[PDB]
């Protein structure tokens, strides 16, 4: 379950305030709703978001200057004091009627991860980004990665030929 590009457009158009800012951050980083919602300005360092320890290990995810500007400038302490999750959830559910109960906190994370793989991302990198302790956790997104078996030709150490010359 994830939001298509069309659904993302509809969602960001129907959200407002800190809710829309949190959505943008989750779609940009794979954050769960909760860890996005409790972000503080001191957790943004040189356009890199730290999700501090909870129960999860700390991890860091880069964001663009544009996103950092939107969510953090001229703000101190908690970035999103006017977060409104039930309102977010109702809007989400209007956009995605087949969303299972309670998964509104993770849909945007699933959207991040799914599009990351569709777009050509590495499952290894996604694991680190999501904070998964095991690759098996991340493999739920693996079927979204295109498999081009002719990579065996172009990427092999002979570049698809029969010859290798020395220095």
Give the distance, in angstroms, between the CA of residue 49 and the centroid of all CA atoms in the same chain: 12
* Contact flags string 108-147 toward a second copy, x per CB under 8 A: ---xx--xx--xxxxxxx--xx-----xx--x--x--x-x
The C-alpha atoms of residue 47 and residue 63 are separated, in whole angstroms, by 5
Q: Which range touches a second copy (CB under 8 A), out of 34-42, 78-86, 90-98, 152-160?
A: 152-160
> Looking at 59, 89, 115, 132, which residue is catalytic?
132
Residue window 24-63: x/- pattern of binding to a second copy, with contact defined by CB under 8 A:
x--xxxx-----------------------------xxxx
* Residue 107: closest CA among 125, 95, 122: 95
Q: What is the DSSP letter of 139?
A: G
Contacts of 47 (CB under 8 A, 6+ apart): 62, 63, 64, 65, 68
Counted residue by residue, the chain has a size of 167
* In the complex, minimum distance from the CB of residue 46 to a second copy, in angstroms, rounded to a whole number: 12
CB 78 within 8 A of CB 34: no
Of the chain, the end-to-end C-alpha distance in Å amounts to 51
| Total chain residues near a second copy (CB under 8 A) | 58
Q: Which residues are catalytic?
A: 32, 106, 109, 132, 141
> Using CB under 8 A as the criterion, which residues of the chain lie in contact with a second copy when the complex forms?
3, 5-6, 8-10, 12-13, 24, 27-30, 60-64, 66-67, 70, 111-112, 115-116, 119-125, 128-129, 135-136, 139, 142, 145, 147-153, 155-158, 160-167
């Amino acid at each position: 379950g994830y939001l298509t590009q069309e659904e993302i457009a509809l969602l960001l158009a129907a959200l407002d305030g800190d809710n829309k800012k949190i959505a943008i951050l989750c779609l940009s980083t794979g954050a769960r709703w909760g860890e996005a919602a409790r972000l503080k300005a001191e957790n943004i360092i040189h356009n890199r978001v730290t999700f501090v320890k909870t129960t999860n290990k700390p991890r860091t995810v880069p964001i663009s200057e544009a996103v950092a500007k939107m969510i953090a400038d001229n703000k101190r302490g908690f970035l999103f004091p006017d977060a409104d999750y039930p309102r977010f959830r109702r809007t989400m559910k209007a956009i995605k009627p087949d969303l299972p109960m309670g998964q509104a906190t993770h849909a945007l994370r699933h959207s991040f991860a799914t599009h990351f793989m569709i777009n050509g991302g590495s499952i290894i990198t996604l694991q680190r980004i999501l904070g998964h302790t095991r690759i098996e956790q991340t493999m739920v997104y693996a079927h979204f990665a295109p498999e081009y078996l002719q990579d065996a030709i172009s990427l092999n150490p002979l570049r698809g030929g029969t010859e290798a010359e020395s220095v």
